[PDB]
Scaffold this active site. Structure first.
Site, mmCIF file in Angstrom:
data_model
loop_
_atom_site.group_PDB
_atom_site.id
_atom_site.type_symbol
_atom_site.label_atom_id
_atom_site.label_comp_id
_atom_site.label_asym_id
_atom_site.label_seq_id
_atom_site.Cartn_x
_atom_site.Cartn_y
_atom_site.Cartn_z
ATOM 1 N N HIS E 138 0.741 -1.381 -0.132
ATOM 2 C CA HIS E 138 -0.017 0.061 0.093
ATOM 3 C C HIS E 138 0.822 1.176 -0.028
ATOM 4 O O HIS E 138 1.564 1.576 1.060
ATOM 5 C CB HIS E 138 -0.956 0.087 1.273
ATOM 6 C CG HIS E 138 -2.064 -0.851 1.126
ATOM 7 N ND1 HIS E 138 -3.158 -0.972 1.922
ATOM 8 C CD2 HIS E 138 -2.220 -2.016 0.453
ATOM 9 C CE1 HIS E 138 -3.910 -1.774 2.013
ATOM 10 N NE2 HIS E 138 -3.429 -2.470 1.014
ATOM 11 N N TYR E 169 -5.671 16.627 0.146
ATOM 12 C CA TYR E 169 -4.584 17.227 0.941
ATOM 13 C C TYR E 169 -4.923 17.665 2.444
ATOM 14 O O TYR E 169 -5.559 18.642 2.582
ATOM 15 C CB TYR E 169 -3.969 18.569 0.323
ATOM 16 C CG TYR E 169 -2.832 19.044 1.022
ATOM 17 C CD1 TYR E 169 -1.915 18.472 1.045
ATOM 18 C CD2 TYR E 169 -2.645 20.490 1.357
ATOM 19 C CE1 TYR E 169 -0.528 19.054 1.877
ATOM 20 C CE2 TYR E 169 -1.646 20.959 1.864
ATOM 21 C CZ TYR E 169 -0.671 20.321 2.164
ATOM 22 O OH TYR E 169 0.694 20.824 2.597
ATOM 23 N N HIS E 216 -12.934 1.737 -3.544
ATOM 24 C CA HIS E 216 -13.575 1.589 -2.176
ATOM 25 C C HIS E 216 -15.144 2.026 -2.332
ATOM 26 O O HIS E 216 -15.591 2.856 -1.613
ATOM 27 C CB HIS E 216 -12.932 2.333 -1.246
ATOM 28 C CG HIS E 216 -12.886 1.815 0.091
ATOM 29 N ND1 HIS E 216 -13.939 1.789 0.942
ATOM 30 C CD2 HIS E 216 -11.647 1.075 0.890
ATOM 31 C CE1 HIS E 216 -13.578 1.242 2.229
ATOM 32 N NE2 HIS E 216 -12.270 0.744 2.085
ATOM 33 N N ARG E 287 -12.376 -10.662 -4.533
ATOM 34 C CA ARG E 287 -11.471 -10.257 -3.497
ATOM 35 C C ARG E 287 -12.009 -10.356 -2.138
ATOM 36 O O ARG E 287 -11.720 -9.978 -1.160
ATOM 37 C CB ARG E 287 -11.317 -8.687 -3.787
ATOM 38 C CG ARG E 287 -10.699 -8.115 -4.927
ATOM 39 C CD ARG E 287 -9.269 -7.889 -4.629
ATOM 40 N NE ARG E 287 -9.174 -6.939 -3.390
ATOM 41 C CZ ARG E 287 -8.210 -7.064 -2.561
ATOM 42 N NH1 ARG E 287 -7.294 -7.802 -2.576
ATOM 43 N NH2 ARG E 287 -8.156 -6.029 -1.509
ATOM 44 N N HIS E 316 -8.902 -10.566 0.216
ATOM 45 C CA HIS E 316 -8.688 -9.492 1.098
ATOM 46 C C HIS E 316 -7.810 -9.668 2.166
ATOM 47 O O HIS E 316 -8.089 -10.473 3.138
ATOM 48 C CB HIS E 316 -10.125 -9.020 1.423
ATOM 49 C CG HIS E 316 -10.022 -7.587 2.036
ATOM 50 N ND1 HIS E 316 -10.729 -7.353 3.189
ATOM 51 C CD2 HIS E 316 -9.462 -6.398 1.711
ATOM 52 C CE1 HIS E 316 -10.760 -6.052 3.522
ATOM 53 N NE2 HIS E 316 -9.820 -5.469 2.571
ATOM 54 N N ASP E 320 -6.701 -5.042 9.244
ATOM 55 C CA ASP E 320 -7.532 -5.682 10.281
ATOM 56 C C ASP E 320 -7.874 -7.088 10.215
ATOM 57 O O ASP E 320 -8.985 -7.620 9.771
ATOM 58 C CB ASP E 320 -8.922 -4.819 10.372
ATOM 59 C CG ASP E 320 -9.328 -4.551 9.010
ATOM 60 O OD1 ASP E 320 -8.784 -4.058 8.109
ATOM 61 O OD2 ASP E 320 -10.724 -4.866 8.741
HETATM 62 MG MG LIG Z 1 -10.570 -2.867 -0.836
#
Ligand SMILES: [Mg+2]
Ligand SMILES: [Cl-]
Ligand SMILES: [Cl-]
Ligand SMILES: [Cl-]
Ligand SMILES: [Cl-]
Ligand SMILES: [Cl-]
Ligand SMILES: [Cl-]
Ligand SMILES: [Cl-]
Ligand SMILES: [Cl-]
Ligand SMILES: [Cl-]
Ligand SMILES: [Cl-]
Ligand SMILES: [Cl-]
Ligand SMILES: [Cl-]
Ligand SMILES: [Cl-]
Ligand SMILES: [Cl-]
Ligand SMILES: [Mg+2]
Ligand SMILES: [Mg+2]
Ligand SMILES: [Mg+2]
Ligand SMILES: [Mg+2]
Ligand code: NA
Lengths: 397, 411, 411, 397, 408
Positions: E138, E169, E216, E287, E316, E320
């Site tokens: 990431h 930002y 997302h 996913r 995924h 978490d």
């Molecule tokens: Mg995702």
């Protein structure tokens, strides 16, 4: 009750094409004229009219066009096809001519009247050079045409600059890649020189295989042609879905149709934007009205096939259909020559990009029987229909 | 390249140049029959069927005035090129007149090729895939007892399949409630036809049980809702097939039938355009294709259509009516012993005049038709016999088929 | 019935009883080639190709131990019955080993039939529908300049179509980021392959413009999302076709491509079961079918498949790799000049050893392959020459094709 | 890391069928056994294993069954089909045998354990008379079977009471209408005599054309067969939609499958209720697991093909799959004979209608190599596969 | 019957009766993690991941109050039956709380089976079909130069695939007068930043690495379609969750006109969410979060289902999730032939303490554990130093400028 007293079929060749007219006489003394022009096989149409339609029809009531059409269409059991349909068309048009005359109205008024003032017209610019095309385009623009079908190059004849096998079979040869390259180049040149001054039409004339058609659609869509005509043969129109799924190009098809199975799926699936049926090929005015109506429901518009191989009677019929049918779009036109005008007096010609329907009783154009006899049928081979690809394969012409 | 030039020279040596094309119409019995004859420089003659009985002079004009000057001088060996070329030669194409004229030539070219190979036609194709083809014949009467009589006769001859029809449908509207002054035509009542036919099946099964396969030809007499009802009415009687339950233009209505009835269906004798059959077969809307070989343009497209059907599991019952030359019938038998998905051949006995014009026409034996075993198609026309029986105009009034209200229905 | 008995007698007279079946594996150059030889009592011998180069001894076991005792004594004339019967003879069916063994016989039976007809094979079929078939060849190099050199050579020879490949894909993972101890195999990187190929098309069109048709074989190297991206990346370069853009089991992903790309597609060299091609063609997911004739069971199913494709407007480019006998190639040329929808024949030059074992193998001339004009297929095996070159085990390590993470991909 | 040290393929014919076992030895000293039985062409399978799989596999790591399977399947480039798949299956099963032995667990425990206590079993009742059938049915019912596949009549051999052509081609003849009539009559008789005492199964064995299959489905649906098997050949399964649209009959199909294109559309469209694949035909345990999983998503259940032409090793494998896969339904069974039990010791037999999975480490059944040598391969023509219809046509056997 | 009973004795002797079920929530770092521990009379203990970080007490209640009394006494060997039984046990089924609870048991049962077999988990399955699984990580920043800095680091570490996110930002957006409390964003600004991000990365790095991006579910369908056409030229390795799970039929509009590579499914906890999606080839990668669909048992089946349709797997793997869950995914990833890539975020020291021996990527690859079982367990004494702590997760109250909730 208007009894049919005689049926005649005259083949006349005043200029380049063998033309076919059907004449229907009735006891009321009113005479009808219709087009049955299938120029490649005119003696077969004439045999069909003389030997079969005539003894079937003499003595029957000319008023009931709908019954006579339904009856004629199934009369040989086997049905559809270009020879039967053209013979029937000539009779059907002549029957509508008679009904309009008896009503003392122009043909399109019988139908329900006008839904437009006149029909827009396109003509043909064809040359083996761009300069030849420019000269023709400039002329037509000056006469007020806003739509021109343009073609660069001629495709057929001896295979001069074509890599054939070492001893090619006799035929009329062309190269599909050459045709595509030239045509794309034509569109590019025309848009650069004329911009959006006029609508450009082009007739692919079923010269291509499906993968070539899909590629060509993608190569010329940017030029927004008014339509690309017959991009595929009638047996392959399911391939149109591939095009419609990924290209915005406007498509026309159908001049070859003489069986309703050819057009139903085509229209139901909105695979074309314009239907191009040749009215006499589908059996005359009676089915042309229904087809126009069927198309209208699906939002498909009409550009009936109007080639030089058709009588001016047939052209006048098409203009009557075109000012009546609300979804009619445009009428193809080629200028008539002196001999043809003599055999078919009062044939209308476009004026400032428009063709106007006749306003006298009937179709408005008949055949001069005496003048027609000066031009008997003459055999022509039509060698272009023996269309071959470089390897000597026949391709749909 | 010299080697390539030599190969072409070798091709020219085995050439069979067409020297003449003729079209003869002959009416030895009830029907105007049409034969095309093709001659070659090598002296080998071919015979083909071009029979469109309702319009024979138009077919003859087509052959004599157009196909002849087109074909003289061309190499008969290349049937495939000649067919592809003939099919598009008038630009506009398909249809009964052009297809029949082309069929006459195509069949004669195949005849020539087989004679030059010194083989029976089916052996050219690749040989037999069955010993002989099963045959059905026709039983028709205005009474059930009259039907039983014909049935009994055919069972004794060894037929295992009979196309049965109870009642005759046409002519003056004797027991039909028409409008007051009905338009001239050949009248029938759809409901009476349905009622008679259902009763016919019920009675045959009660009388004969499972002794023989029962076929029936609906002959496009019905509207679609009538067709769907009829399928449900007779499916319990397990017909071998129900033929032309709908006209060619309404075959999408077959989906309604296929979705709810087990009835076995045959269709296609009227087809003369490939668009008529493709969706039909692709969607498995029939169990047997019934095309008339001369109507689709000859042996060349018949082979292709056979193969096309085979991939979809559709079987073949080519149309073999009395209005076809014995040449056409022999061709159909050659196609039938060769193509693996062929099912059955329709047959009606030839009368003596017809046998005179077309010597050696095969007849079924114990419910089977056997393919000819001499070189070629195996059946020719006797040209001198043929000329004693010239064309004769027939109106075919049955095709002016009217319903009680005076409207035309597909005949 | 005596007449029927006589007709059968006449059938027996023209019988050609199979007297022997043999299978020879020969490796004159790089590939194990397989020829089936069929002898008949009439003294006419047939030759067919049964080449499955990776498993030749299994094909030979299949012919020698099973097809031979099945076929001896049977009538060679009835190719169609023999094919239908052979195809189901083991109950379980289809697949590369059985199909190739059957193809060897089927082709030899057609050879016999054509020799007995005294005609070239294509004339048996119905004759030519083109003068000759256009040909493409292969240009492959690890540099663009090396590719241009081969291209220039072929253009000079008159080829108008060239299958072009930039880079070589396989072997040790030299410039590939694998896991630390990569599993043994032939490694390649899909992204590097895509990048090289796109650049190849761009460069060829810049250099040669429209001079020749560019073909490219993806060889099932890609995952579907890579295939879809690649189609969009090269469609502007108008390849004559892009071949095997996906493996046989993923062809439904072709819909995504057909819906958004104009790219011309070819597929099917791997097929050996009809379920692999039917949906493909019915849905027009490719423009050219590429089946390997011996893999689908011979000339008999090839003709049917040709006809099937023709109805859907799909054209034919049969697989003609180096791993096929010149007999198989000649058969393909006969099918190619006959079937109206044939498009092009792949060709690679024969080496001298191969020419010795199979005399008279045709070579393209000015970008065309011409069909043989003598009786039969026209190309046979020299049995004495063949035995100087016996089978030799080859592992074909390229079929252990691995991606950088060590996983197998369809090779 | 468990290196493969040897690969062997033994054909043995202890009773009626040529059976094929593959043996895999590993350096760890653990030996695996697998079924590769394609009884009609056993020498071709053995050639494939001996000449091709063996040099490919020796030296490779037996642990990684998934890679070895993916690799083997594409190794010849051309792929699928009964000869390659059976050779691979024998190796694949032997590899799972080794892994289970090394894990010291029964095969089904490796998979994830049981999802049922045991699998229900059906057997075969076949006679040319109803009385013969009754006698067999009564016996099986007494042994506690609740499912029996019943067949009246034998179909093949010389065409005695069949109207063939006058000189029929040599083959094994039957009449489809006779077969249908007899089978319907069989169902009617059985239901009248036994009511709902047991589930009736019937194998159509691809004897029918599609229209006959649709009719037959309608004639027997009232008898609620547990399933009707192979009502159509694999090339015609699209015709199943006609049946599924109008009949409630329960269908099973797939014993002939050896290419995934044969089953995907079949299952996706829910055209059958049970899949009947022959595990060795689809390439072994590895693909059988995935296929079971694929079916499960669509609600299709599993009845793996378990004919007499299969080793007891293969049968034991199927029982391990059947107690594990939640959508497994029933296991076909035919009693083993003495010779077969000697060559394959400890083969399980049904008990009160149930087959129980082996509980020792591995598949649980091996081949006695010495005993197998007493029964070498013997050529059989299998004349029933030359199945002909009355007119002499080949039909799918 | 004797022989059958004798078969039943051998099975019994090999039965492995479940003796205890426990559920621990632990928060070593940023996220509440959930571990299920299963004990057996064997003495063999298994560990599984049940991590539904937003509602961990609900999962724990589900394990402790319902799964525990259900499972004690049952044979751990029969994972398939226990899974089928557990899944329907409350009648109403599917969903994140039940599935996660069941996933913890299921994984722990596989852990036990693999330990008894003395094999690494993936070997039970049938072994490796690849040497190791490629890894993406990431790169997230609110400036392009922050992105560059992370990209450069990951490239040096040997990563070949990087998920890149450029964030902003409601202080600069045009909301209504008194905006309802929530976590605001602007879709058009997000789209613009993202397109420019791709453009910049390709300009700077060309084809050095594969770029991944996670939408997302932030967009409406017309925006998703536009965005696909906007970035397809950049050839992202995949665009993730371009639409929410309820609107995936809109994916057809994209598939018909764009070549963009798509991945979807981390939100799925009901098979009806994925079947049509896969059957119609609407995505290129599935996913799914393994614990959300109910553990290893259904993940194996889903992989096989996907494989038939040519769809590949990218389970995924967020922060978490326990390292036990991550190790299980690596076992799945080296075994299933259609596994493609494994998401990874670096473990912090506290998390390493609670879950010892958690594997880290080496040169862009994650290697499956090679000891018996899953290979990663929870240290229970260390876990209790990090008890559960309530977190609101305010980002899930995601609002558009007009104050509307959008799928978060
Ligand atoms: Mg995702
Ligand atoms: Cl001319
Ligand atoms: Cl060409
Ligand atoms: Cl008589
Ligand atoms: Cl009459
Ligand atoms: Cl009449
Ligand atoms: Cl009425
Ligand atoms: Cl050389
Ligand atoms: Cl090698
Ligand atoms: Cl190699
Ligand atoms: Cl990889
Ligand atoms: Cl036997
Ligand atoms: Cl039969
Ligand atoms: Cl840290
Ligand atoms: Cl928070
Ligand atoms: Mg035109
Ligand atoms: Mg009929
Ligand atoms: Mg290839
Ligand atoms: Mg069976
Ligand atoms: Na699109």
């Amino acid at each position: 009750k208007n009894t049919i007293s005689n049926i005649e079929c005259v083949i006349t060749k005043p200029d380049r094409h063998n033309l076919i007219t059907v004449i229907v006489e009735t006891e009321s003394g009113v005479t009808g004229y219709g087009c049955a022009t299938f120029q490649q096989r005119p003696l077969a149409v004439k045999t069909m009219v003389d030997e079969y339609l005539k003894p079937l029809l003499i003595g029957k009531d000319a008023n009931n066009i709908e019954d006579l059409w339904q009856m004629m269409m199934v009369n040989a059991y086997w049905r559809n096809g270009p020879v039967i349909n053209n013979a029937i068309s000539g009779v059907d048009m002549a029957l509508w001519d008679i009904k309009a005359k008896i009503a003392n109205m122009p043909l399109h008024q019988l139908f329900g009247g006008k839904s437009r003032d006149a029909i827009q017209v396109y003509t043909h610019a064809t040359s083996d050079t761009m300069e030849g095309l420019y000269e023709q385009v400039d002329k037509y623009l000056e006469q007020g045409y806003q739509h021109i079908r343009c073609q660069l190059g001629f495709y057929g004849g001896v295979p001069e600059n074509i890599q054939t096998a070492q001893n090619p079979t006799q035929g009329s040869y062309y190269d599909q890649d050459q045709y595509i390259e030239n045509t794309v180049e034509m569109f590019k040149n025309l848009r650069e020189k004329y911009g959006k001054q006029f609508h450009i039409l082009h007739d692919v004339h079923e010269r291509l295989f499906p993968n070539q058609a899909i590629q060509f659609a993608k190569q010329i869509e940017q030029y927004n042609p008014f339509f690309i005509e017959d991009i595929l043969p009638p047996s392959q129109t399911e391939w149109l879905d591939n095009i419609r799924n990924q290209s915005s190009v406007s498509l026309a098809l159908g001049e070859l149709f003489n069986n309703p199975e050819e057009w139903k799926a085509l229209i139901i699936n909105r695979r074309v934007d314009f239907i191009r049926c040749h009215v006499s090929q589908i059996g005359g005015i009676t089915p042309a009205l229904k087809l126009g109506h069927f198309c209208e429901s699906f939002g498909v518009r009409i550009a009936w096939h109007c080639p030089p191989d058709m009588t001016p009677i047939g052209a006048a019929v098409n203009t009557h259909l075109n000012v009546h049918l609300h979804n009619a779009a445009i009428q193809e036109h080629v200028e008539y020559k002196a001999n043809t005008q003599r055999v078919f007096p009062n044939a209308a010609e476009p004026i400032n990009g428009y063709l106007y329907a006749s306003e006298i009783a009937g179709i408005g154009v008949e055949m001069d029987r005496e003048a027609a006899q000066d031009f008997p049928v003459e055999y022509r081979p039509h060698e272009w229909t023996q269309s071959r690809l470089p390897d000597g394969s026949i391709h749909t012409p």
